[PDB]
PDB file of C-alpha atoms and ligand atoms in Angstrom:
ATOM      1  CA  UNK T   1      74.677 164.133  89.761  1.00  0.00           C
ATOM      2  CA  UNK T   2      76.760 160.958  89.878  1.00  0.00           C
ATOM      3  CA  UNK T   3      73.898 158.445  89.773  1.00  0.00           C
ATOM      4  CA  UNK T   4      73.285 158.609  86.033  1.00  0.00           C
ATOM      5  CA  UNK T   5      75.715 156.861  83.702  1.00  0.00           C
ATOM      6  CA  UNK T   6      77.687 158.051  80.687  1.00  0.00           C
ATOM      7  CA  UNK T   7      79.463 155.652  78.371  1.00  0.00           C
ATOM      8  CA  UNK T   8      82.372 157.416  76.715  1.00  0.00           C
ATOM      9  CA  UNK T   9      83.940 158.563  79.993  1.00  0.00           C
ATOM     10  CA  UNK T  10      83.160 155.275  81.786  1.00  0.00           C
ATOM     11  CA  UNK T  11      80.935 157.370  84.033  1.00  0.00           C
ATOM     12  CA  UNK T  12      80.041 154.977  86.847  1.00  0.00           C
ATOM     13  CA  UNK T  13      81.062 154.935  90.486  1.00  0.00           C
ATOM     14  CA  UNK T  14      81.169 151.599  92.268  1.00  0.00           C
ATOM     15  CA  UNK T  15      78.058 151.102  94.368  1.00  0.00           C
ATOM     16  CA  UNK T  16      77.145 148.350  96.807  1.00  0.00           C
ATOM     17  CA  UNK T  17      73.612 147.259  97.529  1.00  0.00           C
ATOM     18  CA  UNK T  18      72.441 148.662 100.873  1.00  0.00           C
ATOM     19  CA  UNK T  19      70.736 145.570 102.267  1.00  0.00           C
ATOM     20  CA  UNK T  20      73.634 143.323 101.248  1.00  0.00           C
ATOM     21  CA  UNK T  21      76.050 145.145 103.540  1.00  0.00           C
ATOM     22  CA  UNK T  22      73.424 145.490 106.282  1.00  0.00           C
ATOM     23  CA  UNK T  23      70.822 142.745 106.634  1.00  0.00           C
ATOM     24  CA  UNK T  24      67.296 143.288 107.941  1.00  0.00           C
ATOM     25  CA  UNK T  25      66.088 139.717 108.307  1.00  0.00           C
ATOM     26  CA  UNK T  26      62.362 139.215 108.821  1.00  0.00           C
ATOM     27  CA  UNK T  27      61.629 135.611 107.891  1.00  0.00           C
ATOM     28  CA  UNK T  28      59.083 134.815 105.210  1.00  0.00           C
ATOM     29  CA  UNK T  29      55.386 134.008 104.845  1.00  0.00           C
ATOM     30  CA  UNK T  30      55.100 130.265 105.443  1.00  0.00           C
ATOM     31  CA  UNK T  31      51.503 129.499 106.345  1.00  0.00           C
ATOM     32  CA  UNK T  32      50.721 127.337 103.300  1.00  0.00           C
ATOM     33  CA  UNK T  33      52.765 124.173 102.682  1.00  0.00           C
ATOM     34  CA  UNK T  34      53.801 123.740  99.067  1.00  0.00           C
ATOM     35  CA  UNK T  35      52.959 120.409  97.444  1.00  0.00           C
ATOM     36  CA  UNK T  36      54.342 118.629  94.392  1.00  0.00           C
ATOM     37  CA  UNK T  37      52.411 115.785  92.823  1.00  0.00           C
ATOM     38  CA  UNK T  38      52.869 112.750  90.572  1.00  0.00           C
ATOM     39  CA  UNK T  39      52.908 113.438  86.856  1.00  0.00           C
ATOM     40  CA  UNK T  40      49.682 111.487  86.599  1.00  0.00           C
ATOM     41  CA  UNK T  41      48.425 113.042  89.815  1.00  0.00           C
ATOM     42  CA  UNK T  42      47.080 109.953  91.561  1.00  0.00           C
ATOM     43  CA  UNK T  43      50.121 107.902  92.469  1.00  0.00           C
ATOM     44  CA  UNK T  44      49.146 104.303  93.155  1.00  0.00           C
ATOM     45  CA  UNK T  45      46.008 102.320  92.454  1.00  0.00           C
ATOM     46  CA  UNK T  46      44.538  98.868  92.940  1.00  0.00           C
ATOM     47  CA  UNK T  47      42.664  96.657  90.512  1.00  0.00           C
ATOM     48  CA  UNK T  48      38.899  96.359  90.822  1.00  0.00           C
TER      49      UNK T  48
ATOM     50  CA  UNK J   1      55.305  94.152 101.278  1.00  0.00           C
ATOM     51  CA  UNK J   2      53.345  97.390 100.936  1.00  0.00           C
ATOM     52  CA  UNK J   3      54.612 100.976 100.900  1.00  0.00           C
ATOM     53  CA  UNK J   4      54.413 104.225  98.955  1.00  0.00           C
ATOM     54  CA  UNK J   5      56.852 102.708  96.463  1.00  0.00           C
ATOM     55  CA  UNK J   6      56.809  98.944  97.204  1.00  0.00           C
ATOM     56  CA  UNK J   7      53.630  98.856  95.029  1.00  0.00           C
ATOM     57  CA  UNK J   8      54.538 101.795  92.741  1.00  0.00           C
ATOM     58  CA  UNK J   9      57.734 100.497  91.120  1.00  0.00           C
ATOM     59  CA  UNK J  10      58.042  97.634  88.629  1.00  0.00           C
ATOM     60  CA  UNK J  11      56.207  94.457  89.600  1.00  0.00           C
ATOM     61  CA  UNK J  12      58.775  91.717  90.237  1.00  0.00           C
ATOM     62  CA  UNK J  13      58.333  88.376  92.023  1.00  0.00           C
ATOM     63  CA  UNK J  14      61.875  88.878  93.315  1.00  0.00           C
ATOM     64  CA  UNK J  15      60.525  91.783  95.434  1.00  0.00           C
ATOM     65  CA  UNK J  16      56.986  91.806  96.909  1.00  0.00           C
ATOM     66  CA  UNK J  17      55.579  88.266  97.380  1.00  0.00           C
ATOM     67  CA  UNK J  18      58.376  86.443  99.207  1.00  0.00           C
ATOM     68  CA  UNK J  19      59.475  87.725 102.677  1.00  0.00           C
ATOM     69  CA  UNK J  20      56.239  88.865 104.498  1.00  0.00           C
ATOM     70  CA  UNK J  21      52.676  87.518 104.150  1.00  0.00           C
ATOM     71  CA  UNK J  22      52.056  87.717 100.386  1.00  0.00           C
ATOM     72  CA  UNK J  23      48.348  88.165 100.999  1.00  0.00           C
ATOM     73  CA  UNK J  24      47.135  88.454  97.400  1.00  0.00           C
ATOM     74  CA  UNK J  25      47.586  89.764  93.794  1.00  0.00           C
ATOM     75  CA  UNK J  26      51.340  90.387  94.223  1.00  0.00           C
ATOM     76  CA  UNK J  27      51.671  86.781  92.941  1.00  0.00           C
ATOM     77  CA  UNK J  28      49.267  87.670  90.134  1.00  0.00           C
ATOM     78  CA  UNK J  29      50.659  91.156  89.263  1.00  0.00           C
ATOM     79  CA  UNK J  30      54.109  89.831  88.228  1.00  0.00           C
ATOM     80  CA  UNK J  31      52.576  87.521  85.634  1.00  0.00           C
ATOM     81  CA  UNK J  32      49.156  89.117  84.969  1.00  0.00           C
ATOM     82  CA  UNK J  33      47.470  85.692  85.151  1.00  0.00           C
ATOM     83  CA  UNK J  34      44.621  84.517  87.396  1.00  0.00           C
ATOM     84  CA  UNK J  35      45.143  80.829  86.560  1.00  0.00           C
ATOM     85  CA  UNK J  36      47.741  79.781  89.153  1.00  0.00           C
ATOM     86  CA  UNK J  37      46.718  82.701  91.396  1.00  0.00           C
ATOM     87  CA  UNK J  38      45.279  80.420  94.087  1.00  0.00           C
ATOM     88  CA  UNK J  39      47.097  77.232  93.024  1.00  0.00           C
ATOM     89  CA  UNK J  40      50.480  78.520  94.230  1.00  0.00           C
ATOM     90  CA  UNK J  41      49.851  81.259  96.794  1.00  0.00           C
ATOM     91  CA  UNK J  42      48.850  78.507  99.229  1.00  0.00           C
ATOM     92  CA  UNK J  43      52.546  77.505  99.091  1.00  0.00           C
ATOM     93  CA  UNK J  44      53.934  80.644 100.755  1.00  0.00           C
ATOM     94  CA  UNK J  45      53.957  79.615 104.440  1.00  0.00           C
ATOM     95  CA  UNK J  46      53.640  75.858 104.987  1.00  0.00           C
ATOM     96  CA  UNK J  47      55.402  74.430 101.918  1.00  0.00           C
ATOM     97  CA  UNK J  48      54.192  72.510  98.900  1.00  0.00           C
ATOM     98  CA  UNK J  49      51.626  69.705  98.909  1.00  0.00           C
ATOM     99  CA  UNK J  50      51.652  68.039  95.455  1.00  0.00           C
ATOM    100  CA  UNK J  51      55.439  67.517  95.322  1.00  0.00           C
ATOM    101  CA  UNK J  52      55.001  64.070  96.902  1.00  0.00           C
ATOM    102  CA  UNK J  53      52.521  63.063  94.159  1.00  0.00           C
ATOM    103  CA  UNK J  54      50.114  61.364  96.597  1.00  0.00           C
ATOM    104  CA  UNK J  55      48.173  60.047  93.614  1.00  0.00           C
ATOM    105  CA  UNK J  56      49.731  56.817  92.368  1.00  0.00           C
ATOM    106  CA  UNK J  57      48.798  54.701  89.316  1.00  0.00           C
ATOM    107  CA  UNK J  58      49.643  57.655  87.033  1.00  0.00           C
ATOM    108  CA  UNK J  59      47.304  60.165  88.672  1.00  0.00           C
ATOM    109  CA  UNK J  60      47.669  63.931  88.473  1.00  0.00           C
ATOM    110  CA  UNK J  61      47.533  66.310  91.433  1.00  0.00           C
ATOM    111  CA  UNK J  62      45.597  69.507  92.152  1.00  0.00           C
ATOM    112  CA  UNK J  63      46.241  71.814  95.085  1.00  0.00           C
ATOM    113  CA  UNK J  64      43.504  73.361  97.184  1.00  0.00           C
ATOM    114  CA  UNK J  65      43.631  75.570 100.261  1.00  0.00           C
ATOM    115  CA  UNK J  66      43.513  72.659 102.690  1.00  0.00           C
ATOM    116  CA  UNK J  67      42.825  69.470 100.698  1.00  0.00           C
ATOM    117  CA  UNK J  68      44.372  67.790  97.656  1.00  0.00           C
ATOM    118  CA  UNK J  69      42.552  66.555  94.546  1.00  0.00           C
ATOM    119  CA  UNK J  70      43.869  63.372  92.906  1.00  0.00           C
ATOM    120  CA  UNK J  71      42.781  62.810  89.296  1.00  0.00           C
ATOM    121  CA  UNK J  72      43.065  59.110  88.452  1.00  0.00           C
ATOM    122  CA  UNK J  73      42.304  57.718  85.009  1.00  0.00           C
ATOM    123  CA  UNK J  74      39.289  55.757  83.738  1.00  0.00           C
ATOM    124  CA  UNK J  75      38.419  53.033  86.230  1.00  0.00           C
ATOM    125  CA  UNK J  76      40.876  54.501  88.757  1.00  0.00           C
ATOM    126  CA  UNK J  77      39.919  56.783  91.643  1.00  0.00           C
ATOM    127  CA  UNK J  78      40.735  57.448  95.287  1.00  0.00           C
ATOM    128  CA  UNK J  79      41.638  60.201  97.737  1.00  0.00           C
ATOM    129  CA  UNK J  80      45.229  59.601  96.600  1.00  0.00           C
ATOM    130  CA  UNK J  81      44.304  57.103  93.863  1.00  0.00           C
ATOM    131  CA  UNK J  82      43.915  54.691  96.779  1.00  0.00           C
TER     132      UNK J  82
HETATM  133 CA1   CA Z 101      49.188  95.862  92.977  1.00  0.00          CA
HETATM  134 CA1   CA Z 102      60.463  93.928  98.921  1.00  0.00          CA
HETATM  135 CA1   CA Z 103      53.145  91.303  92.016  1.00  0.00          CA
HETATM  136 CA1   CA Z 104      53.666  92.630  94.093  1.00  0.00          CA
END
């Protein structure tokens, strides 16, 4: 087998990721909008 | 006058109460002081009213939202110390 690696002989053949060379694009899961908030949470306030 | 950040940043009189309506508080926020809150906010649209000193005979002035109070000394009175 060539997959496993051995140090002393520099046993490693160059390999390229499969999906990098050939893309299978499918979008993402985007049904929930992501929200960031003020450090104190409630942003502005009025005096009462 | 009002926005998400117009009333979220630092309170400065050189910002909010000047170029719109200046309805309220934004003349009080800058100073944190309810003393001249309604003795100065009347002077946002139509100009000042005590600058003429209508009270004569050494009488002080007081501004109200429509009418002027003239404080004249002992034995002196009048609508404008008149
Ligand atoms: Ca405010
Ligand atoms: Ca402004
Ligand atoms: Ca203010
Ligand atoms: Ca203000």
